[PDB]
Design a protein around this ligand. Structure first.
Ligand SMILES: [Zn+2]
Ligand SMILES: [Zn+2]
Ligand SMILES: [Zn+2]
Lengths: 90, 506
């Protein structure tokens, strides 16, 4: 009767880890909100360069709270999959 | 006389003064004599001979004439040397004007490829493969393509994309691997492959999600080919885009074997593709009113996915969706392959009819920027499904749309879906900002990476490493700007007291 139903329907969705209140997870503020290093004017006034970096492990963190966590160790601090860095941007 | 003819007269005298020594001359003389002739028909005018004859010879393709020139010129002092100079400055000159006028970018790549062929082909035959020449052709080729900052890389990609989409022209594998390898050899010349990746990725996703490609095993070699001569991280992402495709299949099989033992009701065959947020491009979510029937399916699935895959979160991307609609017309029964945004709109016409842009934008819920073109099809272009009252190339505010009655189309399964694979200007610009505003971190992150390797290093001795590690330029302005950020945040420092030496500083 209808002049138009739906036979097939292809959908698309993107997944990301559910991390309680999507927190910066290294500074646990918010994934998109200054950081700590930035949030507080110590001797670093580069809050302009504050975004999210995603790793191969796929959890994201602030480019800042993370580039730090790398001098010392070198592994997605939630994953074990050694970090490697595939994407900047919210 | 012209040159082809002059160079002929020279290869004649040399033959005569040569076939003279054999006859009445003393074998001794041959050496002095010939040197004289050579240094009076060639030495003493090389410069003058090229300056007014080479150019013409090349862009006209006088192969034979090019050869006699090569051989001859070789015999002289700096004859083969001087022949290079011009040849190279020729390549660049004619090469530049192939890539510097934005107005001619449509033909940009093909012409670059075709040029490269003429050039190469002359090196084989005419220059006997002399490698000094391959060096210069290669070297110079990269001097002119990069006089135009970012387009080359982009275009190369948009070109490759037209080679992997749906289409008959690429009907063999033997030569598709060739047209694919021929391009790759150009690639190597470009500066800013990070732009190539950029658009490349963006163009695959659209291909992997909406409408088929030339060949599966074909689309694969390309990656294989990029991994090689470029990096394993460069392609890291894309390789992932694919994996996600394989997984989405697996899962899909299970959701169906599970959904099986439910005595099922659902009249819709739903197939879902789950993508890893970090690999794929960034996508802006769009709020739209999905038919109840629809949401349910999507919900039951979500539950099936979140369960069995604990610790995750989905986010449906309507922008990338598409579906199949059965249509009940007069003189037909056709089915369409439409995007989600197209599906919705159309459905309004089941328990409705005759609608105005506004009343549409109300009921599903699209966005002016899109709804326009989403509506530009269905009507305007090809004029076939829907009809626009205030009829015109574009879409305004009042314009009413009528459910058409035409259909003489000799097909079933029409693809209106073309809209889904066109990159709007917005898309373009945006997908370029996220690369300039991307290099910044790639620089920073690459600086730090090295600083750790060797705790102390000289500035110009660093700028050098970056040119090898990054996949792009790096303005001196920006670099300076970078060390700044890193000294302030305490990752490195200037010690020994000479702004040209840097110490790590953990
Ligand atoms: Zn920050
Ligand atoms: Zn992680
Ligand atoms: Zn953080």
């Amino acid at each position: 009767k209808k002049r138009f139903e739906v036979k097939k329907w292809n959908a698309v969705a993107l997944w990301a880890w559910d991390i309680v209140v999507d927190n910066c997870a290294i500074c646990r503020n918010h994934i998109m909100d200054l950081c700590i290093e930035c949030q507080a004017n110590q001797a670093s006034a580069t809050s302009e360069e504050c975004t999210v970096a995603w790793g191969v492990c796929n959890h994201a963190f602030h480019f800042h709270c993370i580039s730090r966590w790398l001098k010392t160790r070198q592994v997605c601090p939630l994953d074990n999959r050694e970090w490697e860095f595939q994407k900047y941007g919210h | 006389r012209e040159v082809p003819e002059y160079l002929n007269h020279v290869s004649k005298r040399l033959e005569e003064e040569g076939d003279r020594v054999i006859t009445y001359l003393d074998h001794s003389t041959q050496k002095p004599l010939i040197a004289c002739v050579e240094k009076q028909l060639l030495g003493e005018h090389l410069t003058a001979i090229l300056q007014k004859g080479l150019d013409h010879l090349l862009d006209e393709n006088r192969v034979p004439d090019l050869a006699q020139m090569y051989q001859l010129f070789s015999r002289v002092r700096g004859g083969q040397q001087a022949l290079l100079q011009h040849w190279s400055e020729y390549i660049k000159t004619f090469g530049t004007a192939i890539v510097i006028n934005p107005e001619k970018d449509k033909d940009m790549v093909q012409d670059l490829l075709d040029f490269k062929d003429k050039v190469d082909h002359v090196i084989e035959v005419c220059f006997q493969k002399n490698e000094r020449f391959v060096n210069l052709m290669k070297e110079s080729f990269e001097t002119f393509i990069n006089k135009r900052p970012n387009k080359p890389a982009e275009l190369i990609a948009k070109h490759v994309d037209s080679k992997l989409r749906a289409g008959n022209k690429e009907a063999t594998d033997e030569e598709l691997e060739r047209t694919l390898d021929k391009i790759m050899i150009l690639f190597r010349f470009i500066h800013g492959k990070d732009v190539f990746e950029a658009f490349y990725k963006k163009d695959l996703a659209k291909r992997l999600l909406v409408g088929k490609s030339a060949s599966v095993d074909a689309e694969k070699s390309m990656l294989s080919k990029l991994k090689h001569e470029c990096g394993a991280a460069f392609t890291s992402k894309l390789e992932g885009m694919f994996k996600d495709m394989e997984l989405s299949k697996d899962i899909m099989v299970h959701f169906k074997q599970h959904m099986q033992n439910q005595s099922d009701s659902g009249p819709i065959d739903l197939t879902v593709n789950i993508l890893t947020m970090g690999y794929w491009p960034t996508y802006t979510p769009m709020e739209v009113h999905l038919t109840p029937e629809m949401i349910k399916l999507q919900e039951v699935f979500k539950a099936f996915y979140l369960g069995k895959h604990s610790g995750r979160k989905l986010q449906w991307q309507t922008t990338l969706g598409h579906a199949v609609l059965k249509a009940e017309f007069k003189e037909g029964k056709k089915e369409f392959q439409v995007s989600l945004f197209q599906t919705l709109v159309l459905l309004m016409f089941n328990e409705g009819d005759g609608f105005s842009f506004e009343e549409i934008k109300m009921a599903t819920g699209i966005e002016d920027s899109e709804l326009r073109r989403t509506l530009q099809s269905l009507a305007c272009g090809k004029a076939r499904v829907l009809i626009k009252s205030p009829k015109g190339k574009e879409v305004e505010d009042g314009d009413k749309f009528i459910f058409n009655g035409e259909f003489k189309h000799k097909l079933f399964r029409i693809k209106i879906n073309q809209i889904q694979m066109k990159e709007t200007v917005e898309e373009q610009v945006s997908t370029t900002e996220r690369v300039f505003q991307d290099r910044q971190y790639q620089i920073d992150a690459a600086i730090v990476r090295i600083m750790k390797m060797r705790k102390t290093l000289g500035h110009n001795l660093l700028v050098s490493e970056l040119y090898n590690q990054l996949k792009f330029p790096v303005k001196p302005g920006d670099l300076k700007k970078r060390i700044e950020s890193l000294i302030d945040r305490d990752y490195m420092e200037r010690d020994k007291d000479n702004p040209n030496q840097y110490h790590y500083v953990a």
